[PDB]
Amino acid sequence: FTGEGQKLGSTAPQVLNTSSPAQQAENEAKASSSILINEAEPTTNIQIRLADGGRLVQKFNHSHRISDIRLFIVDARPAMAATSFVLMTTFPNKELADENQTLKEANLLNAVIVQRLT
Amino acid sequence: VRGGMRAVEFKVVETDPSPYCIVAPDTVIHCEGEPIKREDEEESLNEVGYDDVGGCRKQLAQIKEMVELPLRHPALFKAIGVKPPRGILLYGPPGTGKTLIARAVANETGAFFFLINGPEIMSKLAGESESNLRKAFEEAEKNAPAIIFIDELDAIAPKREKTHGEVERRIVSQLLTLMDGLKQRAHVIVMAATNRPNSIDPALRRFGRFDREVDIGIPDATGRLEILQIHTKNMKLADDVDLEQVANETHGHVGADLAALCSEAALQAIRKKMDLIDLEDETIDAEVMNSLAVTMDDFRWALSQ
Amino acid sequence: PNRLIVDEAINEDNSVVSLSQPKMDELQLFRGDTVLLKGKKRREAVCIVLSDDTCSDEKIRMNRVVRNNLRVRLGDVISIQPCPDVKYGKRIHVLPIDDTVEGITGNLFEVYLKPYFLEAYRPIRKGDIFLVRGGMRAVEFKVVETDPSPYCIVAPDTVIHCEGEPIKREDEEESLNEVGYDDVGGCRKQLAQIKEMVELPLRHPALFKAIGVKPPRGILLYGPPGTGKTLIARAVANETGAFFFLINGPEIMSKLAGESESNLRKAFEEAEKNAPAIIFIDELDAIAPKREKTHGEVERRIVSQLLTLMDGLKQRAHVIVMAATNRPNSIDPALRRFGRFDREVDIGIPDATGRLEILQIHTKNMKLADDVDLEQVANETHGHVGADLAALCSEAALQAIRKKMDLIDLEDETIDAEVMNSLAVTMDDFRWALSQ
Ligand SMILES: Nc1ncnc2c1ncn2[C@@H]1O[C@H](COP(=O)(O)OP(=O)(O)O)[C@@H](O)[C@H]1O
Ligand SMILES: Nc1ncnc2c1ncn2[C@@H]1O[C@H](COP(=O)(O)OP(=O)(O)O)[C@@H](O)[C@H]1O
């Protein structure tokens, strides 16, 4: 009755920026540091498409796992740690299932991974 | 956007996060009443393109390179002494896609396209016919680069011994003259379609005329599949529809055949669900059409015709 | 659950409509109950409802008489409901329709009305138009009034009055003297294809306005002379309620050059104005023969004009061109070229079954003698076509007239419909016409 109302669509509720401006640098710091990069094993690069508003973080090492990315997301940001979601590649739109699956097996090599809250 | 047996064009009027944005599942979509106007430099995706031609790649490739320089780099031949092709002869049975190809090549290269139809020309009285002929070449040169397409050339210039009178042979003569006076700097390429060599008058092949020939025959199963997929892009096919199967029982059919074959299927679908399901009116519901799906049964029916 | 689809009739009887047993079960109807039909323009009709196994559950059979009384064409939907309230009426007032009774003078009651309702218990509603065959013609009567309004059953004690001058035909009352599918016999498979071909373009025009699908435009009819190709193209038009325009080959080829091409164009223009429309080129081969048939500078220019008109057509126009010829070879290859006459239907000589039906169609208005075995005539007119059997009946009739009438009545002023109603055609006359 005074305008500006957001509709109540069937899409899953959203998680905004729970981390303060300062907190998010330390939140990437963990992720960037947090997991293993052994230079003597050939690399790969991932670009995450979070639903947070269109937030994208990249990086990684040689052969790891899809679940390790799911771990990076949580490490890179607290809020999502409780939120349920899934992973993907767009334009064939394959749902990254079998969380363990290694990057080699999923063709997830240097390829963009989208995040969708269930 | 394709569907409901058609394709609608939509112009992004405004995006929230300004210049560009990714349409996420939470993105609010507004499409408030009104259909906007098509501007000048905005062609219709309903125009013919190379994606509307299937079963021709080899031939479509030859033609592309032939016209590539003359139509895309006119200036070149202005400063060159090399001679580009002028006339291209497209032979093959009817409904093979020659007209389609010629029109597709013109648009796809932004060239002016002028159409001459054999019967049209021959329906006129003799002097009028010539008049029209030179008019086509005249208008073509004014808007060059251009492609003049003579559809049903054999209707105008039949073989040496199909000549029947001062009027018949007077027109072919006119067409030959026009071809010899057609200079390079003009930037014109005249394409003509016929059923086969013998059909035409041998003189249209003299070196400065229709010197280049391209055979566009009947499609093979692979080719036929391509076409079927093109003429069903705008409809909803049941999951039991096997186009490849269709293409296999289609030897001998040409593009026009497949195109019609589809229409039959789609009509057989409508007749079934439209007839009894009160889906008729002095206008159509986009949704009603969008829901309707052509089953493999419909194609088995179209074939049995 | 009443709404059904109007299909053709099996029982040519005016008062009866048919359905599938199952359907009668759903509507709780019985082998004789009088039903009340509802169609377009707030119109209604009263009929008897029988059972038919060849009738599809969702459809209802009925003749053009009823179909017209309802303002419906084959394909529309009507609402059927039980009518257990119909009485055994008192007095009914009927009146013929001028154009149907022109030339015949005399008692139309004892000649038509009487035999028609006679022990029939035919139900009738006010405003309906029925047809009575006899005296070598079919008279149409409008039911101006039935004492028990608006409908009653005509029982043997019902009084029928024919008081006064015949009435005019209202613009929207199509004559049953017009060509309709029930006038074509022996072309079951072909008539079926033609129907489904024109069905959507002609019955559902607005469709091809929001759809990219491409309907049929030209449809070629193959068959020897007298096969009934003109009959079919006309009936289709009438039946679908489409405007029918005719183009006769020789009619065009008789014109001074130019005037011939001028008339081809005008033919399509007028046909495009009154769409949905059917242009029917009768004797195409006379206009368009090519590649060995001549290049006589006017003959070819005309064929070319005709090819141009076929290309110029566009679905927006809602026009279907039908053409007829003896065989493919006659026509010029270009006419079959995709985008023109892309559809073709063969209509050859009828078989034993066919010829029989044809014979039945061309006697429906005459009094055949019990000795007349149409099945016999059919079983010895093998090669013959519709046109032949038709002419055959006419000669039989004329014979019959020449025998019993021309002599024993060499006096004029016997245009009376009673005389014609009593004159019978014997199997002996059909035996004579055969030997001709
Ligand atoms: N090779 C093809 N691929 C896809 N569609 C085709 C092809 N050939 C023909 N068609 C379809 O059939 C119609 C036949 O067109 P057209 O080019 O005029 O035939 P032609 O010039 O060979 O006589 C086309 O408009 C198109 O819709
Ligand atoms: N199938 C048929 N059933 C009943 N009568 C027919 C049939 N075919 C032809 N006739 C009769 O013979 C005449 C032949 O008519 P028409 O259609 O003009 O022949 P066509 O076009 O084949 O030369 C018809 O007007 C009709 O009276």
C204 contacts B274? CB cut-off 8 A: yes
Query: CB neighbours of C421 closer than 8 A, spacing ≥ 6?
Result: C111, C134, C135, C367
- Measured between alpha carbons, how far is C211 from C166 in angstroms, rounded to an integer? 48
Locate A55 and state its tokens: 């937030």
* CA atoms in the 13 A half-sphere facing the CB of C146: 23
- CATH numeric code, A1-118: 3.10.20.90
Q: Kindly list the residues from chain B whose CB atom is less than 8 angstroms away from the CB atom of residue A8.
A: none
Query: Is C229 a pocket residue for ligand 2 (Cβ < 6 Å)?
Result: yes
B95 lines ligand 1 (CB under 6 A): yes
CATH 3.40.50.720 fits C1-85, yes or no: no
Domain boundaries, given as residue ranges, for chain A: 1-118
What is the greatest pairwise CA distance in chain C? 74
Dihedral sign, Cα of residue B238, residue B244, residue B245, residue B246: positive
- Distance CA(C236)–CA(C195), nearest Å, equals 7
Nearest to C345 by CA among C378, C369, C322, C367: C322
B287 touches C at CB < 8 Å: no
Assign a CATH topology to domain B219-305: Helicase, Ruva Protein; domain 3 (1.10.8)
Concatenating the DSSP letter of every residue in C220-237 gives: EEE-STTSSHHHHHHHHH
Rounded Cα–Cα distance for residues C186 and C353 (Å): 7
CATH topology of domain C177-348: Rossmann fold (3.40.50)
Pocket test for ligand 1, best of B57, B100, B115, B191 (most atoms within 8 A of CB): B100
The pair of three-digit structure tokens given for residue C223, joined into one six-digit string:
């068959």
- Strands C343-346, C151-153: parallel, antiparallel or unpaired by DSSP? unpaired
Probe site for chain C from B267, B277, B281, B299 (most C CB atoms < 10 A):
B267
List chains touching A (3+ CB pairs under 8 A). Answer: B
Closest residue in chain B to residue C312, using alpha carbons only = B120
CB contact under 8 A, B281 and C214: no
Residues whose CB falls within 8 Å of the CB of residue C280, separated by 6 or more in sequence, listed in order: C230, C233, C234, C237, C244, C245, C246, C247, C321, C322, C323, C324
- Residue C404 gets the label, from left (phi > 0), alpha (psi -120 to 50) or beta, of alpha
B136 φ/ψ angles, rounded to the nearest 5 degrees: -60, -50
Is the Cβ of A90 closer than 8 Å to some Cβ of chain B? Answer: no
A88 touching B (Cβ < 8 Å): no
Burial (CB count <10 Å: 0-12, 13-18, 19+), residue A47: middle
Are the CB atoms for A113 and A69 separated by under 8 Å?
yes
In B120-174, the DSSP E strands lie at 146-151
Identity at A60, one-letter amino acid code: F
Q: What is the DSSP string of C22-34?
A: HHHHHHT--TT-E
- Experimental method used, please? X-ray
- Written as one letter, the residue type at A21 is P
Q: Encoding tokens for residue A11?
A: 């899409």
Closest-CA residue of C relative to B258 is: C338
Tokens of B64: 């592309």
Q: Tell me, in angstroms, the distance from the centre of ligand 1 to residue B255's CA.
A: 5
Q: How many other β-carbons are positioned within 10 Å of the β-carbon of residue A57?
A: 19
> Could you give the angle at the alpha carbon of C138 between the alpha carbons of C136 and C139, nearest 5°?
125
- The tokens of A50 are what? 């979070």
Q: Which chains form contacts with chain C, at 3 or more CB pairs under 8 Å?
A: B
Burial of B276 (0-12, 13-18, 19+ CB in 10 A): middle
| Cα atoms in the Cβ-side hemisphere of radius 13 Å centred on B24 | 21
CB burial readout B106-130, b (16+ within 10 A) else e: bbbbebbbbebbbbbbbbbebeebb
Could you tell me the distance, in angstroms and rounded to a whole number, from the CA of residue B192 to the centre of ligand 1? 15
How far is residue C307's CA from residue B124's CA, in Å, rounded to a whole number? 12
Strand pairing partners for B90?
Answer: B193, B214
Fold for C350-436, please state it.
Answer: Helicase, Ruva Protein; domain 3 (1.10.8)
Q: Which ligand sits closest to the CA of C339?
A: 1
A87 with A66: CB under 8 angstroms? yes
Measured between alpha carbons, how far is B190 from B89 in angstroms, rounded to an integer? Answer: 8
Interatomic CA distance for residues C283 and C16, integer angstroms: 39
Angle at C310 between CA C308 and CA C313, to 5 degrees: 105
Contact C210 B289 (CB under 8 A): yes
- Enter the tokens of residue C310: 């076929």
How many residues can be counted in chain B? 305
- Computed on alpha carbons and rounded to an integer, the radius of gyration of chain C in Å comes to 24
Neighbour-count burial for C169-186, b at 16+ CB within 10 Å, e otherwise: beeeebebeebbbbbbbb
Kindly give, in sequence order, each residue whose CB lies less than 8 Å from that of residue C397, ignoring residues fewer than 6 positions away: C136, C366, C425, C429
CB pairs under 8 A between A and B: 10
Angle formed by the axes of helices B221-230 and B255-276, nearest 10°:
40
Ligand 1 near B230 CB (within 6 A): yes
Task: Check contact C-A (3+ Cβ pairs < 8 Å).
Answer: no
| Residue C276 DSSP class | S
Q: How far apart are CA A35 and CA A110, in angstroms?
A: 18
Residues that constitute the known binding site of C for ATP = 225-231, 326, 362
Entry resolution (Å): 2.9
Superfamily of domain B46-217: P-loop containing nucleotide triphosphate hydrolases (3.40.50.300)
Q: Select from B17, B22, B26 the Cβ nearest to the Cβ of A11.
A: B26
In this complex, do A51 and B28 lie within 8 Å of one another by their Cβ atoms? Answer: no
Residue A75 token pair: 């490490």
Considering only CA atoms, which of B42, B59, B156 is closest in space to residue B100?
B59
| Listed residue (C313, C257, C306, C247) closest to C281, CA to CA | C247
Inter-residue long-range contacts of C390-396, CB under 8 Å, 24+ positions, other chains counted: C390/C226, C390/C358, C390/C362, C392/C359, C392/C430, C392/C433, C392/C434, C393/C359, C393/C362, C393/C363, C393/C366, C393/C430, C393/C433, C394/C362, C395/C432, C395/C433, C395/C436, C396/C425, C396/C429, C396/C430, C396/C432, C396/C433
- Cα–Cα distances in angstroms (integers) from residue B168 to residues B155, B160, C330, in the given order: 10, 11, 23
Q: Residue A93's CB: how many other CB atoms inside 10 A?
A: 8
Cα separation of A81 and A97, whole Å? Answer: 18
Residue C382 DSSP label = -
β-sheet with C129-134: strand ranges across: C129-134, C137-146, C91-96, C159-161
Considering only CB atoms, which chain A residues are within 8 Å of B25?
11, 116
Put simply, the chain C residues between 372 and 431 with a CB less than 8 A from any chain B CB are: none
Nearest 5°: phi and psi at A104?
Answer: -60, -45
Rounded distance between C-alpha atoms, residue B158 and residue C76, angstroms: 51
Chains A and B touch (3+ CB pairs under 8 A): yes
3-class secondary-structure state, position B47: coil
Q: Are C14 and C130 in contact (CB under 8 A)?
A: yes
The full set of domain ranges for chain C reads 1-85, 87-163, 177-348, 350-436
Ligand found nearest the CA of C281:
2
Whole-angstrom distance, CA of residue C103 vs CA of residue C419: 13
